[PDB]
Coordinates of C-alpha atoms and ligand atoms in Angstrom, one line a residue:
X1 CA -15.4 -12.9 -28.4
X2 CA -19.1 -13.9 -28.8
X3 CA -21.6 -13.3 -26.1
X4 CA -22.5 -16.6 -24.1
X5 CA -19.3 -18.3 -25.0
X6 CA -18.2 -21.3 -23.1
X7 CA -14.5 -22.0 -22.2
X8 CA -13.0 -24.7 -20.1
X9 CA -11.7 -22.2 -17.5
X10 CA -12.5 -18.4 -17.1
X11 CA -10.1 -16.2 -15.2
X12 CA -11.8 -12.9 -14.0
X13 CA -8.9 -10.3 -13.9
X14 CA -5.8 -10.5 -15.9
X15 CA -3.5 -9.6 -13.1
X16 CA -0.5 -11.1 -11.5
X17 CA -2.0 -14.4 -10.2
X18 CA -4.7 -14.5 -12.9
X19 CA -2.4 -14.6 -15.9
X20 CA -0.2 -17.2 -14.0
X21 CA -3.1 -19.5 -13.5
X22 CA -4.4 -18.9 -17.1
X23 CA -1.0 -19.5 -18.8
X24 CA -0.3 -22.6 -16.8
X25 CA -3.9 -24.1 -17.6
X26 CA -3.3 -23.3 -21.3
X27 CA -0.2 -25.7 -21.4
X28 CA -2.6 -28.3 -22.5
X29 CA -3.2 -26.5 -26.0
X30 CA -6.6 -28.3 -26.3
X31 CA -7.9 -26.6 -23.1
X32 CA -9.7 -23.3 -23.8
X33 CA -9.1 -20.5 -21.3
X34 CA -10.7 -17.0 -21.3
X35 CA -9.3 -13.9 -19.6
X36 CA -11.6 -11.0 -19.0
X37 CA -9.8 -7.8 -17.9
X38 CA -10.7 -4.1 -17.3
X39 CA -7.7 -2.5 -18.8
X40 CA -5.7 -2.7 -22.0
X41 CA -4.7 -6.0 -23.6
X42 CA -1.4 -4.9 -25.1
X43 CA 0.9 -3.5 -22.2
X44 CA 4.1 -4.7 -24.1
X45 CA 3.3 -1.9 -26.5
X46 CA 3.3 0.9 -23.7
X47 CA 6.9 2.3 -23.1
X48 CA 5.9 3.5 -19.6
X49 CA 5.0 -0.1 -18.7
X50 CA 7.9 -1.9 -20.2
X51 CA 10.5 0.7 -19.1
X52 CA 11.5 0.1 -15.5
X53 CA 12.6 3.6 -14.7
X54 CA 9.1 4.9 -15.6
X55 CA 7.5 2.7 -12.9
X56 CA 6.6 5.7 -10.4
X57 CA 5.3 7.9 -13.2
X58 CA 2.4 5.2 -13.6
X59 CA 0.8 6.5 -10.5
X60 CA -2.4 8.3 -11.6
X61 CA -1.9 7.3 -15.2
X62 CA -4.7 5.7 -17.2
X63 CA -3.2 2.3 -16.0
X64 CA -3.8 3.1 -12.3
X65 CA -7.3 2.4 -10.7
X66 CA -6.1 5.2 -8.4
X67 CA -8.5 4.1 -5.5
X68 CA -9.2 6.3 -2.6
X69 CA -8.4 4.4 0.6
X70 CA -8.4 5.1 4.3
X71 CA -4.6 4.7 5.4
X72 CA -5.3 5.3 9.1
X73 CA -8.4 5.2 11.3
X74 CA -7.7 5.9 15.0
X75 CA -9.6 8.1 17.4
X76 CA -6.8 10.5 17.5
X77 CA -6.0 10.5 13.8
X78 CA -7.6 9.5 10.4
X79 CA -6.4 10.2 6.9
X80 CA -7.7 9.1 3.4
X81 CA -5.6 9.2 0.3
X82 CA -5.8 9.0 -3.4
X83 CA -4.2 7.3 -5.4
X84 CA -3.7 3.9 -3.7
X85 CA -2.1 2.6 -6.8
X86 CA -3.2 -0.6 -8.5
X87 CA -2.6 -2.0 -11.9
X88 CA -5.4 -1.5 -14.5
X89 CA -4.0 -3.4 -17.6
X90 CA -3.3 -6.8 -18.4
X91 CA -0.7 -8.0 -15.9
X92 CA -2.5 -6.1 -13.2
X93 CA -0.2 -4.5 -10.6
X94 CA 2.7 -6.5 -12.0
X95 CA 2.5 -4.0 -14.9
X96 CA 3.2 -1.0 -12.6
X97 CA 5.0 -2.3 -9.7
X98 CA 8.7 -1.7 -8.4
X99 CA 10.2 -5.0 -9.5
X100 CA 11.6 -6.4 -6.3
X101 CA 11.3 -10.1 -6.1
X102 CA 11.7 -11.6 -2.6
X103 CA 9.8 -14.5 -0.9
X104 CA 9.7 -14.1 2.8
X105 CA 10.7 -15.8 5.9
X106 CA 10.3 -19.6 6.4
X107 CA 9.0 -19.1 10.0
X108 CA 6.2 -16.9 8.6
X109 CA 5.1 -19.3 5.8
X110 CA 5.1 -22.2 8.1
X111 CA 2.4 -20.4 10.2
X112 CA 0.1 -20.6 7.2
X113 CA -0.5 -24.1 8.2
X114 CA -3.1 -22.8 10.7
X115 CA -5.1 -21.8 7.6
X116 CA -4.0 -24.3 4.7
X117 CA -2.7 -27.3 6.4
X118 CA 0.7 -28.7 5.6
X119 CA 0.7 -28.1 1.9
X120 CA 0.7 -24.3 2.7
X121 CA 4.1 -24.3 4.6
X122 CA 7.6 -23.2 3.6
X123 CA 9.1 -26.4 2.2
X124 CA 6.1 -27.4 0.0
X125 CA 5.8 -23.8 -1.2
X126 CA 9.5 -23.3 -2.2
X127 CA 8.9 -24.9 -5.6
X128 CA 5.9 -22.7 -6.2
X129 CA 8.0 -19.6 -5.0
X130 CA 10.5 -20.4 -7.9
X131 CA 8.3 -21.9 -10.7
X132 CA 7.4 -18.6 -12.3
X133 CA 10.9 -17.3 -12.8
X134 CA 14.0 -18.0 -15.1
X135 CA 17.0 -16.7 -13.1
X136 CA 19.8 -14.9 -15.0
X137 CA 23.2 -13.7 -13.7
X138 CA 24.8 -12.4 -17.0
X139 CA 27.7 -10.4 -15.4
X140 CA 28.5 -13.5 -13.3
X141 CA 28.4 -11.4 -10.0
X142 CA 26.7 -13.8 -7.7
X143 CA 27.0 -17.2 -6.2
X144 CA 26.0 -20.0 -8.7
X145 CA 23.8 -21.4 -6.0
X146 CA 21.3 -18.7 -6.5
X147 CA 20.2 -20.0 -9.9
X148 CA 17.9 -22.2 -7.9
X149 CA 15.6 -19.4 -7.3
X150 CA 14.4 -19.7 -10.9
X151 CA 12.4 -22.8 -11.8
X152 CA 12.3 -22.0 -15.6
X153 CA 9.0 -20.1 -15.8
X154 CA 8.2 -17.2 -18.4
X155 CA 9.0 -14.2 -15.9
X156 CA 12.7 -13.3 -16.3
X157 CA 14.3 -12.3 -13.0
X158 CA 17.8 -11.1 -12.2
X159 CA 19.9 -9.4 -9.6
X160 CA 19.6 -5.6 -10.3
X161 CA 21.4 -4.5 -13.4
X162 CA 23.6 -2.2 -11.3
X163 CA 24.1 1.4 -12.4
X164 CA 27.7 2.0 -12.8
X165 CA 27.6 5.7 -11.4
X166 CA 25.8 4.4 -8.3
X167 CA 28.8 2.1 -7.3
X168 CA 30.2 4.7 -4.8
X169 CA 26.7 5.0 -3.4
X170 CA 26.5 1.2 -3.0
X171 CA 30.0 0.9 -1.6
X172 CA 29.3 3.6 1.3
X173 CA 25.9 2.2 2.0
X174 CA 27.6 -1.3 2.4
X175 CA 30.3 0.1 4.5
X176 CA 27.8 2.1 6.7
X177 CA 25.7 -1.2 7.1
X178 CA 28.7 -3.2 8.2
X179 CA 29.9 -0.5 10.3
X180 CA 26.7 -0.9 12.5
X181 CA 27.3 -4.4 13.2
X182 CA 24.5 -5.8 10.7
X183 CA 25.2 -8.7 8.6
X184 CA 25.5 -8.7 4.7
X185 CA 23.4 -11.5 3.1
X186 CA 22.9 -12.6 -0.5
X187 CA 20.9 -15.8 -0.2
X188 CA 17.5 -14.7 1.2
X189 CA 15.5 -17.4 -0.6
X190 CA 15.9 -20.5 1.7
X191 CA 13.8 -19.0 4.5
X192 CA 16.4 -16.8 6.1
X193 CA 16.8 -13.1 5.4
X194 CA 18.8 -11.3 8.1
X195 CA 20.9 -8.5 6.6
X196 CA 21.6 -6.2 3.6
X197 CA 21.2 -7.7 0.2
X198 CA 21.6 -7.1 -3.6
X199 CA 17.9 -7.7 -4.5
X200 CA 16.5 -9.4 -7.4
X201 CA 14.1 -7.9 -9.8
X202 CA 11.3 -8.7 -12.3
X203 CA 13.6 -6.8 -14.7
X204 CA 15.8 -8.4 -17.4
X205 CA 17.8 -6.7 -19.9
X206 CA 16.2 -3.3 -19.0
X207 CA 12.6 -4.6 -19.5
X208 CA 9.9 -5.1 -17.1
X209 CA 8.8 -8.7 -16.6
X210 CA 5.2 -8.6 -16.1
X211 CA 2.6 -11.5 -15.7
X212 CA 1.4 -10.9 -19.2
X213 CA 4.4 -13.0 -20.4
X214 CA 2.4 -16.0 -19.2
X215 CA -0.5 -15.5 -21.6
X216 CA 1.1 -14.6 -24.9
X217 CA 1.4 -16.8 -28.1
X218 CA -1.1 -19.3 -26.7
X219 CA -4.0 -19.5 -29.2
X220 CA -6.2 -21.5 -26.7
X221 CA -6.3 -18.3 -24.6
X222 CA -9.0 -15.9 -25.4
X223 CA -8.1 -12.4 -24.0
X224 CA -11.0 -10.0 -23.6
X225 CA -9.6 -6.7 -22.4
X226 CA -11.5 -3.4 -21.6
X227 CA -14.4 -5.2 -20.0
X228 CA -15.7 -4.4 -16.5
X229 CA -17.0 -7.3 -14.5
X230 CA -20.7 -7.0 -13.1
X231 CA -21.2 -10.1 -11.2
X232 CA -20.3 -13.9 -11.0
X233 CA -23.0 -16.1 -12.5
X234 CA -24.0 -18.3 -9.6
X235 CA -26.7 -21.0 -9.7
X236 CA -28.4 -21.2 -6.4
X237 CA -30.0 -24.7 -6.7
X238 CA -26.7 -26.1 -7.9
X239 CA -24.6 -24.0 -5.5
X240 CA -22.4 -23.6 -8.7
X241 CA -20.6 -20.8 -10.2
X242 CA -21.3 -21.0 -14.1
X243 CA -19.3 -18.0 -15.4
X244 CA -19.2 -14.3 -15.3
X245 CA -21.1 -11.1 -16.5
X246 CA -18.9 -8.3 -17.8
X247 CA -19.8 -4.9 -19.3
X248 CA -18.1 -3.6 -22.5
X249 CA -16.7 -0.2 -23.4
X250 CA -20.0 0.3 -25.5
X251 CA -22.0 -0.5 -22.3
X252 CA -23.3 -4.0 -23.4
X253 CA -23.6 -6.9 -20.9
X254 CA -22.0 -10.1 -22.0
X255 CA -22.0 -13.6 -20.3
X256 CA -19.1 -15.9 -20.5
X257 CA -19.3 -19.4 -19.1
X258 CA -16.8 -21.9 -17.7
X259 CA -17.4 -25.4 -18.4
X260 CA -14.9 -26.5 -15.7
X261 CA -14.2 -23.7 -13.2
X262 CA -14.1 -19.9 -12.8
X263 CA -11.0 -18.5 -11.1
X264 CA -11.5 -15.0 -9.5
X265 CA -8.2 -13.1 -9.8
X266 CA -9.3 -9.3 -9.3
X267 CA -6.8 -8.6 -6.6
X268 CA -7.1 -7.9 -2.9
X269 CA -9.8 -5.0 -3.4
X270 CA -12.1 -6.0 -6.3
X271 CA -12.1 -9.8 -5.6
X272 CA -14.0 -9.2 -2.3
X273 CA -16.2 -6.7 -4.1
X274 CA -17.3 -8.9 -6.9
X275 CA -17.8 -11.8 -4.4
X276 CA -20.1 -9.6 -2.5
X277 CA -21.9 -8.2 -5.6
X278 CA -22.6 -11.9 -6.5
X279 CA -24.1 -12.8 -3.1
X280 CA -21.2 -14.2 -1.2
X281 CA -20.1 -12.0 1.7
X282 CA -21.2 -10.9 5.2
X283 CA -25.1 -11.3 4.9
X284 CA -26.0 -7.9 6.6
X285 CA -23.4 -6.1 4.5
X286 CA -25.1 -7.5 1.5
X287 CA -28.6 -6.8 2.7
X288 CA -27.6 -3.1 3.4
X289 CA -27.0 -2.7 -0.3
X290 CA -30.1 -4.8 -1.6
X291 CA -28.0 -7.9 -2.5
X292 CA -29.3 -11.3 -1.8
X293 CA -27.2 -13.7 0.3
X294 CA -26.4 -16.9 -1.3
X295 CA -23.6 -17.8 1.1
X296 CA -23.2 -16.0 4.4
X297 CA -19.3 -15.6 4.2
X298 CA -18.4 -13.5 7.2
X299 CA -14.7 -13.1 6.1
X300 CA -15.3 -11.7 2.6
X301 CA -13.5 -8.4 2.6
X302 CA -12.4 -8.7 6.2
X303 CA -8.7 -9.3 7.3
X304 CA -7.3 -6.7 4.8
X305 CA -3.6 -6.6 6.0
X306 CA -0.9 -4.4 4.6
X307 CA 2.5 -3.1 5.5
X308 CA 2.8 0.6 6.6
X309 CA 5.7 2.5 5.4
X310 CA 7.1 5.9 6.5
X311 CA 9.5 7.1 3.6
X312 CA 12.0 9.8 4.2
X313 CA 14.2 11.7 1.8
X314 CA 17.9 12.8 2.3
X315 CA 19.6 15.1 0.0
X316 CA 23.0 13.5 -0.8
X317 CA 26.3 14.9 -2.4
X318 CA 26.1 15.3 -6.3
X319 CA 26.5 11.9 -8.1
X320 CA 25.2 9.9 -5.2
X321 CA 21.7 9.7 -6.6
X322 CA 20.2 9.6 -10.0
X323 CA 17.9 12.7 -9.8
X324 CA 20.1 14.7 -12.2
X325 CA 20.2 11.9 -14.7
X326 CA 16.6 10.5 -14.8
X327 CA 14.3 13.1 -13.1
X328 CA 15.4 16.4 -14.5
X329 CA 15.4 17.2 -18.2
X330 CA 18.7 18.0 -20.0
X331 CA 21.6 16.6 -21.9
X332 CA 22.4 13.9 -19.2
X333 CA 18.7 12.6 -19.4
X334 CA 18.6 12.9 -23.2
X335 CA 21.8 10.9 -23.4
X336 CA 20.7 8.0 -21.3
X337 CA 17.3 8.1 -22.9
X338 CA 19.0 7.9 -26.4
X339 CA 21.0 4.9 -25.3
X340 CA 17.8 3.1 -24.0
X341 CA 16.0 3.7 -27.3
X342 CA 18.8 2.1 -29.3
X343 CA 19.6 -1.1 -27.3
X344 CA 17.7 -0.8 -24.0
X345 CA 21.0 -0.2 -22.0
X346 CA 21.7 2.4 -19.3
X347 CA 19.9 3.6 -16.2
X348 CA 16.6 4.2 -18.0
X349 CA 16.4 0.5 -17.7
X350 CA 16.9 0.5 -13.9
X351 CA 14.3 0.1 -11.1
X352 CA 16.5 2.5 -8.9
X353 CA 16.4 0.1 -6.0
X354 CA 19.6 -2.1 -5.8
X355 CA 20.3 -2.7 -2.1
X356 CA 17.7 -3.6 0.5
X357 CA 17.9 -4.2 4.2
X358 CA 16.0 -6.7 6.5
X359 CA 17.0 -5.8 9.9
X360 CA 15.7 -6.7 13.4
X361 CA 15.8 -3.7 15.8
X362 CA 15.6 -5.4 19.1
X363 CA 18.1 -3.0 20.7
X364 CA 16.1 0.0 19.6
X365 CA 12.7 -1.6 20.8
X366 CA 14.3 -2.4 24.2
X367 CA 15.0 1.3 25.0
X368 CA 11.1 1.9 25.0
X369 CA 9.2 1.3 28.2
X370 CA 6.0 0.6 26.4
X371 CA 7.7 -2.0 24.2
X372 CA 9.3 -3.7 27.3
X373 CA 5.9 -3.9 29.1
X374 CA 4.2 -5.5 26.0
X375 CA 7.0 -8.0 25.4
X376 CA 6.8 -9.1 28.9
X377 CA 3.0 -9.1 28.7
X378 CA 3.4 -11.6 25.7
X379 CA 5.4 -14.0 27.9
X380 CA 8.8 -12.6 26.9
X381 CA 8.3 -13.1 23.2
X382 CA 8.8 -10.2 20.8
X383 CA 5.2 -9.2 19.7
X384 CA 6.2 -8.5 16.0
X385 CA 8.6 -11.2 15.1
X386 CA 8.4 -13.9 17.6
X387 CA 10.1 -16.5 15.4
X388 CA 13.2 -14.4 14.4
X389 CA 11.6 -12.8 11.3
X390 CA 12.9 -9.4 10.1
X391 CA 11.3 -6.3 11.6
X392 CA 11.8 -4.1 8.6
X393 CA 12.4 -3.9 4.8
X394 CA 14.5 -0.8 4.2
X395 CA 14.4 0.0 0.4
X396 CA 17.2 2.5 -0.3
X397 CA 15.9 4.1 -3.5
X398 CA 18.7 6.0 -5.2
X399 CA 16.7 9.1 -6.3
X400 CA 13.9 11.2 -5.1
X401 CA 10.8 8.9 -5.3
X402 CA 7.5 10.8 -6.1
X403 CA 5.6 7.6 -5.4
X404 CA 6.9 7.8 -1.7
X405 CA 6.4 11.6 -1.2
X406 CA 2.6 12.0 -1.6
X407 CA 2.4 15.5 0.0
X408 CA 5.8 17.0 -0.6
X409 CA 6.9 18.8 -3.9
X410 CA 9.6 17.2 -6.0
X411 CA 12.8 19.1 -5.1
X412 CA 14.0 21.5 -8.0
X413 CA 17.8 20.9 -7.4
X414 CA 20.1 18.2 -6.0
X415 CA 20.4 14.4 -5.8
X416 CA 18.6 12.5 -3.1
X417 CA 18.2 9.1 -1.5
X418 CA 14.5 8.0 -0.7
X419 CA 14.5 5.5 2.2
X420 CA 11.3 3.6 2.4
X421 CA 11.0 2.3 6.0
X422 CA 8.6 -0.6 5.5
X423 CA 7.4 -2.3 8.8
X424 CA 7.0 -5.8 7.5
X425 CA 5.7 -7.4 10.7
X426 CA 3.1 -5.1 12.2
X427 CA 0.7 -6.3 14.9
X428 CA -2.2 -3.8 14.1
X429 CA -5.6 -5.6 13.6
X430 CA -6.5 -5.9 9.9
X431 CA -8.6 -3.4 8.0
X432 CA -11.6 -4.1 5.8
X433 CA -12.9 -3.9 2.2
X434 CA -16.6 -2.9 2.2
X435 CA -19.2 -2.2 -0.3
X436 CA -20.2 1.5 -1.0
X437 CA -23.2 0.1 -3.0
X438 CA -24.3 -2.4 -5.4
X439 CA -22.8 -0.5 -8.2
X440 CA -20.0 -2.5 -10.0
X441 CA -18.4 0.7 -11.2
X442 CA -17.7 2.2 -7.9
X443 CA -14.8 1.4 -5.9
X444 CA -15.1 -0.7 -2.8
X445 CA -14.5 1.3 0.5
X446 CA -11.0 0.6 1.7
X447 CA -9.6 1.0 5.2
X448 CA -6.0 -0.3 5.8
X449 CA -6.2 0.5 9.5
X450 CA -2.4 1.1 9.7
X451 CA -1.2 1.8 13.3
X452 CA -4.3 0.7 15.1
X453 CA -1.9 -0.6 17.8
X454 CA 0.3 2.0 19.4
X455 CA 3.2 -0.5 19.3
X456 CA 3.5 -0.4 15.6
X457 CA 4.0 3.4 15.9
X458 CA 6.8 2.6 18.4
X459 CA 8.3 0.2 16.1
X460 CA 8.1 2.4 13.0
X461 CA 9.6 5.4 14.9
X462 CA 12.6 3.1 15.8
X463 CA 12.9 1.8 12.4
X464 CA 13.3 5.4 11.2
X465 CA 15.8 5.9 14.0
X466 CA 17.8 2.9 13.0
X467 CA 17.7 4.1 9.4
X468 CA 19.0 7.5 10.5
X469 CA 21.7 6.1 12.7
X470 CA 22.8 4.1 9.7
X471 CA 23.0 6.9 7.2
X472 CA 24.2 9.7 9.5
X473 CA 26.7 7.7 11.6
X474 CA 27.7 4.8 9.5
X475 CA 31.1 4.6 7.9
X476 CA 31.6 6.2 4.5
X477 CA 27.8 7.1 4.1
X478 CA 27.9 9.6 6.9
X479 CA 29.9 11.9 4.7
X480 CA 27.4 11.8 1.8
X481 CA 24.4 13.3 3.6
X482 CA 23.8 17.1 2.8
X483 CA 20.3 17.7 4.3
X484 CA 16.9 16.2 5.3
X485 CA 13.9 16.9 3.0
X486 CA 11.6 18.6 3.5
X487 CA 12.4 19.4 7.1
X488 CA 14.1 17.6 10.0
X489 CA 12.7 14.3 11.2
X490 CA 11.8 15.0 14.9
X491 CA 13.7 12.0 16.2
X492 CA 14.5 13.8 19.6
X493 CA 10.8 13.8 20.7
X494 CA 8.7 10.6 21.0
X495 CA 5.5 12.7 20.9
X496 CA 6.4 14.4 17.6
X497 CA 7.4 11.0 16.1
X498 CA 4.0 9.9 17.0
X499 CA 2.4 12.6 14.8
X500 CA 5.1 12.3 12.1
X501 CA 4.6 8.5 11.8
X502 CA 0.9 8.8 11.5
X503 CA 1.0 11.8 9.1
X504 CA 3.8 10.7 6.9
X505 CA 3.1 7.0 6.5
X506 CA 1.7 5.4 3.4
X507 CA 1.0 1.9 2.0
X508 CA 4.1 -0.1 1.0
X509 CA 1.7 -1.4 -1.7
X510 CA 1.3 -4.9 -0.3
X511 CA -2.4 -5.4 0.5
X512 CA -3.5 -8.9 1.2
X513 CA -6.0 -11.2 2.9
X514 CA -9.5 -10.1 2.0
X515 CA -10.6 -13.6 0.7
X516 CA -8.2 -15.6 2.8
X517 CA -7.4 -19.3 2.5
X518 CA -8.7 -21.4 5.5
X519 CA -9.9 -24.6 6.6
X520 CA -13.6 -23.6 6.8
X521 CA -16.0 -20.7 6.2
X522 CA -15.9 -19.6 10.0
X523 CA -12.1 -19.0 9.3
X524 CA -11.9 -17.8 6.0
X525 CA -13.5 -17.6 2.5
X526 CA -11.6 -20.3 0.5
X527 CA -10.4 -23.7 1.5
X528 CA -6.8 -25.1 1.2
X529 CA -7.5 -25.9 -2.5
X530 CA -8.6 -22.2 -3.0
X531 CA -12.2 -23.2 -3.6
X532 CA -14.8 -20.6 -2.3
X533 CA -16.5 -22.1 0.7
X534 CA -20.1 -22.9 -0.2
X535 CA -19.7 -22.6 -4.0
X536 CA -18.6 -25.3 -6.6
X537 CA -16.4 -24.5 -9.6
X538 CA -15.1 -21.1 -8.1
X539 CA -11.6 -20.5 -7.0
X540 CA -9.8 -17.4 -5.9
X541 CA -6.1 -16.9 -6.8
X542 CA -4.6 -13.6 -5.9
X543 CA -3.3 -11.6 -3.0
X544 CA -6.7 -11.8 -1.2
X545 CA -5.9 -15.4 -0.5
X546 CA -2.8 -14.7 1.4
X547 CA -3.5 -15.5 5.2
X548 CA -0.4 -14.0 6.9
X549 CA 1.4 -11.2 5.0
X550 CA 5.0 -12.1 4.0
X551 CA 8.0 -10.3 5.6
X552 CA 8.9 -8.3 2.5
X553 CA 7.4 -7.2 -0.8
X554 CA 4.9 -9.6 -1.9
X555 CA 4.7 -10.2 -5.7
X556 CA 6.8 -13.5 -5.2
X557 CA 4.1 -15.0 -2.9
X558 CA 1.4 -13.8 -5.3
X559 CA 2.9 -15.6 -8.2
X560 CA 3.4 -18.8 -6.1
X561 CA -0.3 -18.7 -5.2
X562 CA -1.1 -18.7 -8.9
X563 CA 1.3 -21.5 -9.7
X564 CA -0.2 -23.7 -6.8
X565 CA -3.6 -22.9 -7.8
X566 CA -3.1 -24.1 -11.3
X567 CA -1.4 -27.3 -10.1
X568 CA -4.4 -28.1 -7.8
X569 CA -6.7 -27.5 -10.7
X570 CA -4.8 -29.7 -13.1
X571 CA -4.8 -32.5 -10.4
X572 CA -8.5 -32.5 -10.2
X573 CA -9.3 -32.4 -13.9
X574 CA -7.4 -35.7 -14.6
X575 CA -9.2 -36.1 -18.0
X576 CA -7.5 -32.9 -19.2
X577 CA -4.1 -33.3 -17.4
Ligands
FAY1 C1 3.0 0.8 -6.7 C2 3.1 -0.8 -6.4 C3 4.3 -1.1 -6.1 C4 4.5 -2.5 -5.6 N1 5.9 -2.8 -5.6 C5 6.3 -4.1 -5.7 C6 7.6 -4.5 -5.8 O1 8.5 -3.8 -5.8 N2 7.8 -6.0 -5.5 C7 6.9 -6.8 -5.1 O2 7.1 -8.0 -4.8 N3 5.5 -6.4 -5.1 C8 5.2 -5.0 -5.6 N4 3.9 -4.7 -5.5 C9 2.9 -5.6 -5.0 C10 2.4 -6.6 -6.2 O3 2.5 -5.9 -7.4 C11 1.0 -7.0 -5.9 O4 0.7 -7.5 -4.6 C12 0.5 -7.9 -6.9 O5 0.8 -7.6 -8.3 C13 -0.9 -8.2 -6.8 O6 -1.4 -9.4 -7.7 P1 -2.9 -9.8 -7.7 O7 -2.9 -10.8 -8.9 O8 -3.3 -10.3 -6.4 O9 -3.7 -8.5 -8.2 P2 -3.5 -7.6 -9.4 O10 -3.8 -6.2 -9.2 O11 -2.1 -7.8 -10.0 O12 -4.7 -8.2 -10.6 C14 -6.0 -8.0 -10.5 C15 -6.4 -7.6 -12.0 O13 -7.9 -7.7 -12.0 C16 -8.2 -6.7 -12.8 N5 -9.6 -6.2 -12.4 C17 -9.9 -5.8 -11.1 N6 -11.2 -5.4 -10.9 C18 -11.8 -5.7 -12.2 C19 -13.1 -5.4 -12.5 N7 -13.9 -4.8 -11.8 N8 -13.4 -5.9 -13.8 C20 -12.4 -6.4 -14.8 N9 -11.1 -6.5 -14.3 C21 -10.8 -6.2 -13.1 C22 -7.2 -5.5 -12.6 O14 -7.3 -4.7 -13.8 C23 -6.1 -6.3 -12.5 O15 -5.6 -6.7 -13.8 C24 3.6 -3.5 -5.9 C25 2.4 -3.1 -6.3 C26 2.0 -1.7 -6.4 C27 0.7 -1.3 -6.9 O16 -0.2 -2.1 -7.0

């Protein structure tokens, strides 16, 4: 690509929303679209990217930004971790995520109206939540009604391609779930999600469905990988964004210009950073690093919101986890690896997560005096999910998961279940993404501020207790549990649970909100059309725009944001669409 080139649209960051916006805008083959991306351009060529069972091994790989981020910052406890995994490749974090495809609760999306007006509520957003996907049910295992969740887009999705050997696992987990009086549910896509479900995945035929599927075989898309953004090109007199400056592998600075619009899609952490490096952010934060303020945008990098998770591992009877097939080397692994290389069948093509629970835990919360005081203090409404939303997403990963055990060694023997207790409706104040310096090659400073509010600790403790009650007492599954790893979860002591939750928690990998959609610059940084407040020809389309975090894994809302962004761009450029 030649220095100084003009394109109709420039997408900065070839990630999840970025490739969505780019591929959609290229559907007029006459429209020129450029994508600049820090990582490789050929992820479909990388077996670890395309193979679903390899997803966790991508942590700390060359495709992981591997940021340091502060998980918790309380007066009694603070912890910083590395890596906070983020995709560094075309496809962004959709090239290394764990595939689950779930929208979230209608009541939550309706509340986005406070930020985006009526067009950002559940009903208008449903088509955008489905437009990216083509649904498949090859083994004809699920209700025909659910083909509605795919609108026909280039991301193939399916219910998990079930591992045959895990069917006893699945059958005892289901029995245990029902034995605790909690519903089963398969249609979690119409605004309601109460119960245990067979999840859908961005996996089809044993292959990962990443956002790069949007931007291939489209000659009007110029893809420039391996370039690192320096700054957006802003004209102050015009108050207009003209393009972007990037740095190449050889250390050369290139300017690419957009003749219509630039769309910033660098994800929740680098989008606020690049905005700030370009003169759009909190004015004193900018001054403190020698950056001129073009627009005093107080919310840039603020309102970082994520889900905390406390994972825990149980060792289970042999044959009720996949550790011995996929994790440990030997004939069993060689066998399924051999089958995969010939036709991409077998469990090597599995994302290892097939049942997911979305419970409320009201009866656990009610046993805590502090929760009772707080609910009464909120006028009798549950502080976490006052509109009936789930309290947790419980991922039952059917193997020891290194990506959820950041400080314990991998067990040398045995089969395991990794339960990821994900608090999806926390009430802690948000964190922030701040600049370390004006250096584009340094990571922003990242504070997730998990568990700022003690009530989130109480909730997370009870979500662990719920999960333990389910697996140790529930019918059928109670017989499968051999031991706890690496030691007993101290559920008999509230005070020990306090320490355990803080010390064992991690990100569930759903950061949002750092450039949020809003009605004005005093509320957020982009408007309901995703235009940056105070700047012409600049939109943001990624997780940083999300104003209230969905009640589940978030890749579905992030694709929807990209789809809607492209539609609102097309509607404005009528001479092109
Ligand atoms: C472990 C992991 C596990 C999960 N698990 C599941 C899952 O199971 N299901 C689910 O729904 N969500 C999952 N998620 C959340 C879900 O994946 C995430 O929320 C969405 O994928 C987020 O979608 P954006 O579009 O908002 O952000 P993006 O990062 O994709 O794209 C940004 C792009 O910009 C480029 N880029 C950045 N900076 C520069 C720069 N300086 N110069 C030049 N280029 C730069 C950068 O290289 C990248 O290409 C999971 C993510 C992680 C891990 O990140």
